[PDB]
Design a protein around this ligand. Sequence first.
Ligand SMILES: Nc1nc2c(ncn2[C@@H]2O[C@H](COP(=O)(O)OP(=O)(O)OP(=O)(O)O)[C@@H](O)[C@H]2O)c(=O)[nH]1
Ligand SMILES: Nc1ncnc2c1ncn2[C@@H]1O[C@H](COP(=O)(O)OP(=O)(O)CP(=O)(O)O)[C@@H](O)[C@H]1O
Ligand SMILES: Nc1nc2c(ncn2[C@@H]2O[C@H](COP(=O)(O)OP(=O)(O)O)[C@@H](O)[C@H]2O)c(=O)[nH]1
Ligand SMILES: [Ca+2]
Ligand SMILES: [Ca+2]
Ligand SMILES: [Mg+2]
Ligand SMILES: [Mg+2]
Ligand SMILES: [Mg+2]
Lengths: 435, 423, 256, 59
Amino acid sequence: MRECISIHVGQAGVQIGNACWELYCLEHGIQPDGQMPSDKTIGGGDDSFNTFFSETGAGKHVPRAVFVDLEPTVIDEVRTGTYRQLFHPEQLITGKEDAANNYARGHYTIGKEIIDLVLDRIRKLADQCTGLQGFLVFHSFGGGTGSGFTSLLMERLSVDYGKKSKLEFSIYPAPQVSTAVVEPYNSILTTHTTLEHSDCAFMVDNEAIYDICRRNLDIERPTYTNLNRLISQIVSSITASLRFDGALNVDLTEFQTNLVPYPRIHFPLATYAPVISAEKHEQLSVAEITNACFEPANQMVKCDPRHGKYMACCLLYRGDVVPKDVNAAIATIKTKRSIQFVDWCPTGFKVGINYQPPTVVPGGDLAKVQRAVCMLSNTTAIAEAWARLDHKFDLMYAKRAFVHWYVGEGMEEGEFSEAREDMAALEKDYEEVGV
Amino acid sequence: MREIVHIQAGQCGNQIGAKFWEVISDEHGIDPTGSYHGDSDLQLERINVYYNEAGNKYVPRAILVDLEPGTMDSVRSGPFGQIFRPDNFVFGQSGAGNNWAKGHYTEGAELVDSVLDVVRKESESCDCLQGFQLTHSLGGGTGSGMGTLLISKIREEYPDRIMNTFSVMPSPKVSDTVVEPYNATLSVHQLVENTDETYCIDNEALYDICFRTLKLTTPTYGDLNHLVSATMSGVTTCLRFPGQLNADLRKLAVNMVPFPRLHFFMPGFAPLTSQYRALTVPELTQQMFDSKNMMAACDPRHGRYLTVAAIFRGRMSMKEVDEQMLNVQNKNSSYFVEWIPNNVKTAVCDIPPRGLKMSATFIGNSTAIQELFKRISEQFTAMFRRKAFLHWYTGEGMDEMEFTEAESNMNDLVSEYQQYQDA
Amino acid sequence: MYTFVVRDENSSVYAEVSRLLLATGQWKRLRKDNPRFNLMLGERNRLPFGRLGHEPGLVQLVNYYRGADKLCRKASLVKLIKTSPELSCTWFPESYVNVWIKYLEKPLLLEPGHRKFDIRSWVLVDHLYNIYLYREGVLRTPYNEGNEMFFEEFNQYLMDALNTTLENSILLQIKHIIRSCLMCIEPAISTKHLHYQSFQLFGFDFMVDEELKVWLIEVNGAPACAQKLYAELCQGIVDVAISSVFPLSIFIKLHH
Amino acid sequence: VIELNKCTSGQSFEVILKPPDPSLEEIQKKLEAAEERRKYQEAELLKHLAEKREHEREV
Ligand SMILES: Nc1nc2c(ncn2[C@@H]2O[C@H](COP(=O)(O)OP(=O)(O)OP(=O)(O)O)[C@@H](O)[C@H]2O)c(=O)[nH]1
Ligand SMILES: Nc1ncnc2c1ncn2[C@@H]1O[C@H](COP(=O)(O)OP(=O)(O)CP(=O)(O)O)[C@@H](O)[C@H]1O
Ligand SMILES: Nc1nc2c(ncn2[C@@H]2O[C@H](COP(=O)(O)OP(=O)(O)O)[C@@H](O)[C@H]2O)c(=O)[nH]1
Ligand SMILES: [Ca+2]
Ligand SMILES: [Ca+2]
Ligand SMILES: [Mg+2]
Ligand SMILES: [Mg+2]
Ligand SMILES: [Mg+2]
């Protein structure tokens, strides 16, 4: 067994982290107390769920997680939440002055003052790992801490844990819920500085999550709680292979080798189905949920893979699913949809089935479904998200709007341009992979 | 970032300041004795932004300044006179005679060290100081001259804190003296250099709203301050209540100020009050964007919006608010600059102000604010071209050169706004 | 009120619809790069499809179908017909990427004159992928007004010369070609579940031989129209493709 | 269906339809370069503010 340490950064990262560990606890039968009546090996053990949970001599299952935020309002809700006794105080790190939606303030000014501490707190979790695999980092693109401090942390984790993988779960900025006007700046800045330090990043567009909540769950104006519960399900689908027994995506290295042939193009598109309102329903079949994986409306990033090319595709089922029905579904979809792979890759699917149907938190808005699927496909169509973002960046930077806020924090105007040209180089790499 | 240090200086500054505290104290459930008496907890969750704790009594983090004792003596006996901290009454005896030079260089310099001594004690006991909030007029002497002197000293000791002002720009329609353009031009240059956020409250607009919209034959300063206090309560809602948008002063500055010197904001409020029929959401959004609802006498259609912050108070459909806000933008997108995408940010607070079930507060960084500085500049030049009334200032040691610099510095500010209106 | 932008001043067809849209009092034209539009009349080449459908509170439509160029450019049209089991094909000349251009040896010749001709048909596909063929086609006329004969005169000719009508001898085949081509690519380009909608005007080029057999030569994605037919067609684009999604016959509906 | 693995919790397989960094001192360097620029900009402001005190005394 090999351990995984989760790092939650900023409001988005921390609040999403809460929704994930709450879900993890329900799936592994871990009560808010931290006890786990199913775990018969007290004080230790090397089961699959130990990849995310350590054990105390008193039978408490505590996460291999660290929550950091440059202001305490959000992490204080963890210290008093229903899962407060789950976490150990040294796992929750807070400042008192946040980055004010300023990448430079998060990376340079305030990040410098706290980077040393969080690494020691991470070193504490690492020291109690027999063989740490790597890190899962949850953060936003638009926040000053999520963008600015993560890139600094990702740089230091590479120099301190060189042989260890890092996966991202990144929240892509959407104006329907965005906090700031400068989120395009912070997004480009943190992508540039983190690109070489991230082995594979799962990008989630709040716009897509927002509209899925409006359409499928029929919430008039979704809140972060709505968005994070849906996001938590998707995260749980991606990480289920590390926490449960299986043979597909069993370690963080396997995510890279299965979904990322080219290192820079390490942003798989995620598609989830089905999402049904708890206030409702006919149960969908293997073919119907697999077909839904190719509807733009169910993707974490709105884009059209029909006009891109696939480098890798992975199907992760949860519930009542047998391999026979998966093949019969793939055979039907491949003849009735536009699934074109790159010439230098096989046209196929890596399938993983977990018999335990998806768990939904009581009192939530998700109807318990008997079988679900999350598809991870590395398609060049996701570059549409970079195109939208780079365009917004170009509009403001042409007039140097808001640039003074970043230069006032010790950052140089050159980092803006050098980060933009890196995205121009990321944008061209996609172009010549799905020609 | 949680605590804000409030400073009200001068006649206008202290009168407007007294109403501000009278209003938000009611919203947070604080009576004149400093004891809380409210039914909801949202009143107390962020009350530490503007109030210190004493017998579980809340006292404003407010500093009352003036070179005359007259106005601050009436505050001490006002409806909420006993709530302010006794020591935070810092006053002289000479007055400033509506003379910027007296407030900035002679009379005020003699008193400002005492104010800073009170500022220091208020700030050093702050867990995390956001910055400072000043209320004053730019047409007088103390609030204008000593106010900007105070801002300059505060920036020196707290260079990494936000400086936010509610300024009252003079207008011949409600004028005390003819030298108001002089004092206003000298003050604006200071504000351009040493503030991050300035809410431009134009007495011309306040008067016009009272005489035209509210149909008051003869508006008083109380009628004018009724509009100001309502605006001040609105624009600070995000600071005083839980929320994700512009919930503190530096995040507000980052969203609203694309260029350091273009930080002069045009506030609006709807509905206009002096009332049982509540407004629809579409009616609130149409009024909060209407010229007749602005507190700066400027036509927004004569310029272009760089950034906008809209705050809705009351129990309303957040959907319907989103539709109507996304609606106004898409219908008049020509008045929003194309090079700042998504420059309109909306917030909704569940608690409405006193007497109203629904209200809307508008904060706009429009290039039409230029019209106002142009108005002050022409009044200034009309006298300065003949050096009229200058002896009042040269008698206090000022030189003509300082006036010509202030004149051209504001003309530069006007040119800066016209640059981005044609971009 | 509805809003739209224009990014192709060289389009004669859509320069007209831009005029009628402004002539109804319910459409306000924005400048090229204002993203808060309901309708884009976008550029021919490199249309930013990836930036559409991301404006909250705005239903966005564009006059081009992403992916339709696989049908319009000949090189892609050849590979589409031979690699699609839906076509494989009797009405397409032999093409590769004894007279070749396959140049059809014996075309139908208009008498008097011994004249060669080719038929241009205008087809409109709306956001719901309804296929609308404009009822008024044009004919673009030795062989070894303005070279344009409209459908009425050509019909009367075939009734007098070869004792048949245009509907029976040519138009049934034409309608079959349009349906086959356009429904071959429906799963690849349709916007029925996309975050933005698409319609597009197409210009099909057809041929007729002395056996009255119809051949597909070329399909154009940015075609022009005959002068007299500019008014009726352009106004039909407003009623069918624009007003249908933004509410304020001359088409035959090739059903399915 | 290639590489079928089964366990009690589920099973996984693969279908095929068709064959075909900066060091620590460099980081701390750029972080200290950004700090000295902050300190320099603040020094020029406090120098600018010291000039206006000189003018205040001169008036
Ligand atoms: N899905 C989701 N997005 C969130 C959540 N919280 C914030 N965001 C998004 O994150 C972006 C803002 O970044 P934040 O994480 O809130 O800011 P931060 O990381 O705390 O950085 P600073 O506050 O500037 O120090 C916006 O685009 C929000 O829409 C959340 O709980 N769920
Ligand atoms: N297989 C063929 N046999 C006979 N003539 C042919 C032909 N293919 C093309 N043509 C001739 O060429 C003309 C049309 O040219 P073509 O459609 O191939 O290219 P193009 O795009 O330049 C015409 P347009 O400007 O209308 O799109 C027809 O009038 C027809 O006379
Ligand atoms: N809105 C408002 N403006 C005022 C009030 N009192 C004075 N003013 C304005 O302030 C200017 C005079 O400055 P004042 O505050 O009286 O001088 P100071 O005490 O030396 O700062 C004039 O332009 C007045 O119109 C008031 O109560 N309300
Ligand atoms: Ca155990
Ligand atoms: Ca004296
Ligand atoms: Mg935060
Ligand atoms: Mg006075
Ligand atoms: Mg002293």
